[PDB]
């Protein structure tokens, strides 16, 4: 007990609350949660025990591998004849004398091979497994047998043309220094009649008693609206109540919908709002399930109180909203009454609905040409022609936001068993399925059930909240488990933690897939424990989230001891930024920075504030600040510019000093997706052979409006450069930074980051470019900063990166005439292959967009802001005409030369 109140309080100060405020919750569904999820928490330790010691190096120090071992020829043909040069460190004399050990291996070299190799250099200047490879500069390891070159740092190396720096370390030195922590099971550990929903022979009915806590302007008249809905597509019409003054909103009255009881899918919900009066407008919202997390259906009197319309939603219901009561009491409330059946109605058992499923096919198997003509949904199997099937092809080929017509949706559901064939067409045929009957219903579960498995890519799509359906989520988990790499996990995570609040329930198979793999991937468990934790101020997600890092925190072992090291550090800067913008804003930079030096020196917030691991990046140690380095930035919301010493022995072969960009005030989760297509983008251009450089910087959301931003060394803003101006000042610049023969190599690299650039912006709808927000490294790396706004930010489609006569020139080697020279013909031909490249893989980008509408981002609130991206990559045109599109947009916004 005495190590469990400890524990509580580790735990309280990771999440930001009280873990005593969790045990004070009635609900059952929150008990049982807190119960019921640490199984995951239990075979998770026993993964991490199951090889020990190296199971447990494994868990805190994942290989960082790329996907497949397989490099592209452009990556291979930068390789002498198909090997790498590759330098190795040893620590030997005392005083830590480091030798190294220049190494010419096969590129597919095993680390044990390489450490051999190592040390056959090391004796010719004059045991092979008690060793391991570090990484120079970083706690980054290559303790699997993996090809050298699938390591993210060594691919890096070959493709940027860097020589890679390992260091040689005993397996002891590392194992003794990851201490064992055992997971303790917790103290909350040990803890009429019975229908089947397919026998309540009635139709539904809400009744709607009061409200209370309408506090409004005497607004006049006012009345609740409700529907039911699966997902966001409505099962019946929708249904209001009489009208009554705001004065005194009671209405004691019954609803009856449109939808027989039994006939109810699993994730049905009741979507209602008051509205007032004609201009009709939604004053407070609220979406309730019909079942609860037992599968019993709804049953007696409930109270839901209600949340505020969102500014943008004109809508009267909110179906995409949030399902269940607000946590604040004090909000409009209103009290509801449900139908009473003398039992406990449950929804049936998987073998109910089996056998219904298989009475009904079989059922259809018997049905007459006459029969199956009387419904459009009703096929026969001779009668599937090879027309059919080739429109079903092309159906499966159409992108998420193209609409399925009511023709395509009775055409796929009659060819059901035909979809099985082509798998990919699941998202689409789920969408015709009829949710409001448990017969069609009954079927497509079966069909889930055994369904061909699906790329993970494609899979991510049933977990948005178009697909509420338990039985469907399950089957895009099972995939994730089966084909998804931590690779990819590590990629798609922000996607995967935001479509946990679209889950019906606290406990769920995908919360427990994302916690398993948290807890058995520290890099993954990192930005886990981040993207939760930057949203504990949302009320909407805090309680889930906040009982999500309880059963993290609970079993992730030491890293919780450095996590509230981050978390103090993050802390103290909070409070730093908040006083500078309260109590010193209008004070000179001098009396600021005065200020910030004499506050950060408080022996208190001095060690919170160092002695560390970088939240952008974990294997980034972050040592003792470098105050005389440490600025305010002049930029809005004022940033802390932060500097620390790198720790780490060999410090000078990565970079010597780390250096950060704290910003307090602005939302940074709209750059956080930016970079991450930005980078999702690059890895599509490379993997096609297609060489445009990106550079998508680290950036992570740590809270509301608080974030940090990766600095990115050797760069300067267009602006700063021309301040030292004539045009030719940018190209005057880059040629003074690479004289004689590298000058070419410079002009290359701005070339293809440009059009990388223009293509990435021009998709994606990014805030208008400027010489402020456009920077460019001494080498030539062009690139863009800034990332605030994106999609339909403006009420048709623009250009943000308009190339001005300064990068027209840099790209023509100073040539007057840029606009009518070869140079500028094969930055064009750049931009035309990357953009069909994006256009060729427009799902994903549309998914990755759909999965991320949960999220109260301003610029992607429903899926019409989506519907920019496929204007801008014109997925309705053909091919020849989506490329006519977008020089027509190159050439409108240059005024020529497109
Ligand atoms: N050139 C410079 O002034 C300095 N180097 C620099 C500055 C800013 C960023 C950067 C590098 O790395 C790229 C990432 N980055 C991103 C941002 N920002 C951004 O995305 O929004 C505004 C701005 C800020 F102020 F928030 F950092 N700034 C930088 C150099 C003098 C020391």
């Known amino acids: 007990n005495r190590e469990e109140k400890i524990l509580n309080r580790e735990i309280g100060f990771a ?38 010691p190296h199971s447990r190096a494994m868990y805190v120090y994942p290989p960082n591998v790329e996907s497949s071992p397989e490099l592209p020829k452009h990556i291979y043909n930068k390789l002498d004849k198909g ?6 460190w040893v620590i030997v004399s005392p005083n830590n004398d480091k030798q190294k050990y220049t190494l010419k291996i096969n590129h597919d070299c095993v680390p044990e091979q390489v450490i051999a190799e190592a040390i056959r250099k090391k004796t010719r200047s004059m045991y092979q497994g008690k060793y391991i490879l570090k990484v120079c500069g970083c706690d980054e390891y290559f303790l699997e047998k993996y090809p050298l070159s699938q390591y993210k740092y060594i691919r890096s190396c070959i493709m940027l043309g860097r020589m890679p720096n390992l260091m040689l ?56 609206r409700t529907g039911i809905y699966h997902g966001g597509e409505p099962l019946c019409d ?33 979507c209602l709002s008051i509205c007032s009066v004609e201009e009709h407008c939604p004053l407070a919202w ?38 269940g009561s607000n946590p604040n009491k004090e909000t409009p409330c209103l009290e509801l009454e449900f139908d009473w059946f003398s039992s406990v109605v449950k929804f049936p058992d998987m073998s109910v609905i089996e056998e219904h499923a298989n009475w009904s096919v079989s059922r259809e198997a018997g049905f ?8 459009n949904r009703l096929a026969r199997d001779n009668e599937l022609r090879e027309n059919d099937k080739e429109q079903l092809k092309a159906i499966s080929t159409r992108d998420p936001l193209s609409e399925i017509t009511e023709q395509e949706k009775d055409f796929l559901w009659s060819h059901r068993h035909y979809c099985v064939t082509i798998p990919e067409i699941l998202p689409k045929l789920l969408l015709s399925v009829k949710w409001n009957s448990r017969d069609e219903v009954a079927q497509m579960y079966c069909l ?92 909407t997600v805090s309680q889930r989230f906040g009982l999500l890092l309880e059963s993290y925190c609970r079993a992730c072992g030491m890293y919780l001891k450095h996590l509230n090291r981050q978390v103090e550090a993050m802390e103290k800067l909070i409070n730093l930024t908040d006083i500078l913008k309260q109590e010193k804003k209008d004070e000179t930079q001098k009396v600021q920075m005065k200020f910030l030096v004499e506050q950060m020196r408080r022996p208190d917030f001095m060690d919170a504030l160092q002695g560390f691991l970088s939240p952008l990046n974990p294997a980034h140690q972050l040592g003792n600040l470098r105050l005389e380095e440490c600025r305010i930035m002049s930029s809005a919301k004022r940033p802390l510019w932060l500097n620390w010493e790198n720790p780490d022995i060999m410090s000078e072969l990565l970079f010597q000093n780390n250096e950060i960009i704290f910003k307090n005030g602005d939302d940074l989760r709209q750059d956080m997706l930016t970079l991450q297509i930005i980078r999702i983008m690059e890895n599509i251009w490379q993997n096609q052979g297609l060489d445009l450089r990106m550079l998508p910087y680290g950036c992570l959301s740590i809270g509301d409006c608080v974030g940090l931003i990766e600095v990115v060394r050797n760069s300067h803003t267009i602006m700063q450069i021309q301040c030292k101006f004539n045009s030719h000042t940018l190209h005057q610049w880059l040629k003074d930074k690479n004289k004689g023969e590298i000058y070419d190599a410079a002009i290359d690299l701005f070339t293809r980051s440009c059009a990388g650039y223009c293509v990435a912006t021009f998709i994606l709808g990014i805030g208008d470019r400027h010489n402020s927000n456009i920077m460019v490294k001494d080498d030539g790396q062009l690139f863009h900063i800034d990332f605030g706004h994106f999609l339909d930010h403006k009420k048709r489609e623009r250009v943000p990166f308009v190339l001005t006569q300064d990068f027209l020139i840099v790209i023509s080697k100073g040539a007057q005439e840029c606009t009518k020279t070869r140079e500028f013909e094969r930055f064009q031909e750049m931009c035309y292959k990357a953009y069909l490249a994006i256009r060729q893989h427009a799902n994903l980008f549309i998914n990755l967009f759909s999965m991320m509408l949960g999220s109260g981002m301003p610029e992607l609130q ?11 990559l014109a997925l309705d045109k053909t091919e020849q005409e989506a490329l006519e599109y977008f020089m027509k947009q190159m050439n409108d916004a240059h005024h020529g030369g497109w």
């Not at 005593?20 to 239990?42: A, G, H, T």
């Not at 007459?368 to 419904?375: E, F, I, M, N, P």
């Open 15 to 52: 999440i930001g609350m009280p873990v005593c405020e969790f045990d004070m919750v009635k609900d059952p569904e929150v008990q049982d949660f807190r119960r019921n999820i640490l199984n995951v928490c239990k075979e998770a330790v026993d993964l991490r025990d199951l090889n020990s």
């Open 83 to 88: 090997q790498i040069i590759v330098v190795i």
């Open 169 to 224: 370390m005993a397996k002891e030195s590392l194992y003794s220094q990851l201490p064992m922590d055992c997971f303790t099971m917790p103290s909350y550990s040990r803890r009429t009649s019975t229908k089947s929903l397919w026998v309540i022979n009635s139709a539904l009915r809400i009744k709607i008693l009061c409200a209370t806590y309408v506090n409004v302007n005497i607004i006049d008249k006012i009345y609740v």
């Open 238 to 270: 929708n249904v209001n109540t009489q009208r009554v003054p705001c004065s005194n909103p009671r209405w004691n009255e019954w609803l009856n919908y449109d939808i027989y009881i039994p006939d109810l899918p699993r994730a049905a919900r009741l």
């Open 286 to 323: 609220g979406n309730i399930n019909l079942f609860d997390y037992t599968d019993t259906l709804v049953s007696g009197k409930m109270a839901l109180n209600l949340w505020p319309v969102p500014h943008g939603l004109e809508d009267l219901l909110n179906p995409i909203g949030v399902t």
């Open 368 to 375: 007459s040409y006459s029969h199956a003509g009387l419904s």
């Open 448 to 539: 889930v059930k055994d369904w061909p498995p699906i790329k993970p890519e494609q899979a991510m799509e049933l977990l948005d909240c178009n697909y509420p359906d338990p039985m469907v989520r399950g089957f895009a988990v099972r995939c994730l488990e089966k084909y998804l790499t931590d690779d990819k996990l590590s990629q798609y995570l922000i996607q995967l933690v935001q479509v946990l609040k679209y889950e019906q329930y606290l406990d769920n198979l995908l919360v427990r897939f994302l916690l398993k793999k948290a807890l058995t991937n520290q890099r993954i468990g990192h930005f886990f424990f981040w993207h939760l934790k930057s949203e504990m101020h949302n009320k």
């Open 862 to 872: 429903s899926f019409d802001d989506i519907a920019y991206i496929r204007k801008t």
